[PDB]
Design a protein around this ligand. Sequence first.
Ligand SMILES: Nc1ncnc2c1ncn2[C@@H]1O[C@H](CO)[C@@H](O)[C@H]1O
Ligand SMILES: Nc1ncnc2c1ncn2[C@@H]1O[C@H](CO)[C@@H](O)[C@H]1O
Ligand SMILES: CN1CCOc2cc(C(=O)O)ccc21
Ligand SMILES: CN1CCOc2cc(C(=O)O)ccc21
Ligand SMILES: O=C(NCO)c1ccccc1
Ligand SMILES: O=C(NCO)c1ccccc1
Ligand SMILES: [K+]
Ligand SMILES: [K+]
Lengths: 330, 330
Amino acid sequence: MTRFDVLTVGNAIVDIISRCNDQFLIDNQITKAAMNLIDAERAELLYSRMGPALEASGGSAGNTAAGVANLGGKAAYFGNVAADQLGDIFTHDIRAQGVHYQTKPKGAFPPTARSMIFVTEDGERSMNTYLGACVELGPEDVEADVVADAKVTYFEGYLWDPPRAKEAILDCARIAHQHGREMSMTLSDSFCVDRYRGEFLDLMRSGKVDIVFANRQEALSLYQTDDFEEALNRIAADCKIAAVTMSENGAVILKGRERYYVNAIRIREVVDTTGAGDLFASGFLYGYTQGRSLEDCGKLGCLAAGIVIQQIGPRPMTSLSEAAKQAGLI
Amino acid sequence: MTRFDVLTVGNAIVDIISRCNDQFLIDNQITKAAMNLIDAERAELLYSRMGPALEASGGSAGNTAAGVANLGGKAAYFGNVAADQLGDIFTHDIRAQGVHYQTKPKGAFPPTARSMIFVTEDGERSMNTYLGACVELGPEDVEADVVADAKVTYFEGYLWDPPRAKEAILDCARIAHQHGREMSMTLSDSFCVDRYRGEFLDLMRSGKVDIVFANRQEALSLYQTDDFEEALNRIAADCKIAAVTMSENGAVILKGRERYYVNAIRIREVVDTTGAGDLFASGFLYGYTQGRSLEDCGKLGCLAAGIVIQQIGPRPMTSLSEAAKQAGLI
Ligand SMILES: Nc1ncnc2c1ncn2[C@@H]1O[C@H](CO)[C@@H](O)[C@H]1O
Ligand SMILES: Nc1ncnc2c1ncn2[C@@H]1O[C@H](CO)[C@@H](O)[C@H]1O
Ligand SMILES: CN1CCOc2cc(C(=O)O)ccc21
Ligand SMILES: CN1CCOc2cc(C(=O)O)ccc21
Ligand SMILES: O=C(NCO)c1ccccc1
Ligand SMILES: O=C(NCO)c1ccccc1
Ligand SMILES: [K+]
Ligand SMILES: [K+]
C-alpha cells in the first residue's frame, strides 16, 4: 500500500466565470477556446469589461486532483497561491475535497493567480489567465515524500509558462521513477503545445513522462499536422500510454499497437466545457490506479468529463463515485 | 427627470455557497432557513467544516439593486466593503450590472463581509454571516444627491445589527421624504424581526417607511402571532403599502383596505432559494417605479423570484427584462 493514488502539479488558479456573446471575444481579441496568458494591466482591463461573475477554484491539475478524490481515490496537489483571500479560497476548496495540499504561500505578492473565463452560448470556454503567485512555484515546493508515495504524478504542460516550475517537475520525474512510480502529463492547450513543442516531445521520448493526455487539437499541434491518424500513430510511438479525447466523438486510448475506442456519454446540454479535459484525466487516472483496464479507464474518464460539462464551474458539484456506481462502471 | 428608480442600502456581502445534508445543520447548531450572525472565530470554524464552495456577490439589498438593473431600471447601492479581494469582487459585480456604486472602503480590516450559505436537498438556504466591514457603514456613506434623485430608497432590516447603519437610514428617510420620494424596507428575517420588533413598527408607524416587504414568517414574527390573517390586517394598518410573500402560495399586496393576490410561477425544480425575497423586491420596485399597477408589481416580483430560485447564486444570470417581455409584463 501507498499514501496517494494520484499527485497532480499545476498552476493554482481561482476562476472568475461569466457568460458572453461571440462578439465580445472578437472585440477583445480573446482567442476562442484557448488559454490566453495576460499581464496585470490586461487583467484589470478585461475585468472592467466583464459582466457580473461567479468564482470557483480552478487550475487544470487542481481540478484533476479534486476529481480523483471525488471518485474515491486518494489525491495530493502541488501548486502555489499567495497569502490572500483568493489563495485562502483555493486552499479551502481543494483540502475540503480531501486532497492533500500543503504548498505554503511565500507572501501576499504577486497575488493568487486568476483566470477570467468567458463561456459562449455553445458552451465553449475562453480563458484569460494572470499567473501571479504561480510564477513562484519551484523545486522547493516538491514534497519528496509525497512524490515517492504516489502511484502517479501528473502535471500540466501549462507549467512550462512560469519560469521555474519545470525544475520542480524534473525533480518529480526523478523521485517518482526511482520509487517505481509513473509520470503523466497533459498537453494542456494547443497554443501551449506550440510554445513548448520540442520540450514536450523530449519529456515523452526521454521517458520522463509515461502517460500523455491530449485532445484532438493538441495532438495535431504536437506534430504540426492536419492528419489526425498521423498524430495518433506518432503519439503512440512517443509515449507508453496516450489518452486522446475527441469531444463529442469520445476518446481513444493508445498503448503500443493497441487502440481502445470509448464513446462520449449522452449529454442533456453543453452548459460549460470548462474542466472537461481535467475530469477526463480524473476518471482515467482513478481507473488506472485501481488496476482497471485501459478501456474502463477511458469509460471513467468520459463519464467524469460528461458530468462536468453539464454544470457551470470546473469541479463537479455532484458525487462522481455515485455516478460511476449508477453507470455500471463502479 | 430623476437619476435613479431604486436606491438600495444594505450589508455588502460576498456569498460562499455549498450543498449540505440536514444533519450538517443540526451538528453545527445552524438555524435552518435563517440568517445566523457569526463572529470571526466561528466563521473560521464553519469554513473549516464546509465542503468545496462557489463564490458569488450577495447582500440582500445588493441583490435587489442588481435585479432592478437587470430588469432595465436605474439602480444605485450604498454598502461598505473592505479594500481586499472580496471587496473588489463585490464592487465589480454590482457595477458591472450597471448599478451606481460609489461607497468607499475605509481600509482592509475588518475584511469584507461574507456569508457561508448552506443549501439543503429541499433547496432551503441557511446563512452564516460574518459582518466584517459592514459594521463601518454610517451617515458618512450617504450620498445625499443620490437619495434626493431616487424615486424609492429601499433598505434591509438586517441593517439594525451593525451599530451605525440605522443613523444612515434615518438620514436617508429625511432626505427622501423632503424630496417627495418614498422609503421602503424589507423585514429581512424572522429572527431579525424578533431582535428589532419595536424599532421596525416605529419605522412604519412614524411614516419613515412607506412600503414594507415581508414573507409569511416575518409578518407572523412582527406581531408575535400564529394567525396569518391577523398579521395581514395589522401590517396593512401599520404601513402605506405592504408586499407579503408566501413562497409557493404566491404573494399578497396590501394598500389600506385593498388586497391584490398574485400566483407563484410553477417551478421546474427548486435549486436554491437564496435571493428569492430580494428578487421579489427587484420585480416589485421595478414595476412600482415604472408606474405599474400594484398587481403587476406583484407579478413582476413573482417572476423575478421564480427565476432566481431555479439557479445557484442569489443574482439571476439570465435576462429578467427578456423574461418580463416574454411574460407580457414588458
Ligand atoms: N495557465 C493555466 N495553467 C493551469 N490551469 C489553467 C491556466 N489557465 C486556466 N486554467 C484552468 O483551466 C481549467 C479548465 O481546464 C480552469 O479551471 C482554469 O482555472
Ligand atoms: N446580515 C445580512 N445582511 C444582509 N444580507 C445578508 C445577511 N446575511 C446574508 N445576507 C444575504 O442574503 C442574501 C439572500 O437573501 C444572500 O445573497 C446573502 O449574502
Ligand atoms: C493549435 N495551434 C496553436 C499554435 O500554433 C499552431 C501551430 C500548428 C502547426 O505549426 O502546425 C498547429 C496548431 C497550432
Ligand atoms: C421570527 N421567529 C424567530 C425569532 O423569534 C420569534 C418570536 C415569535 C414570537 O414572539 O411569537 C414569533 C416568531 C419568531
Ligand atoms: O481571509 C478571508 N477574509 C479576510 O481575512 C477569507 C478566507 C477565505 C475565503 C474568503 C475570505
Ligand atoms: O485584487 C484582486 N487580485 C489581486 O489581489 C482581485 C480583484 C477582483 C477579483 C479577484 C481578485
Ligand atoms: K463545467
Ligand atoms: K438562487
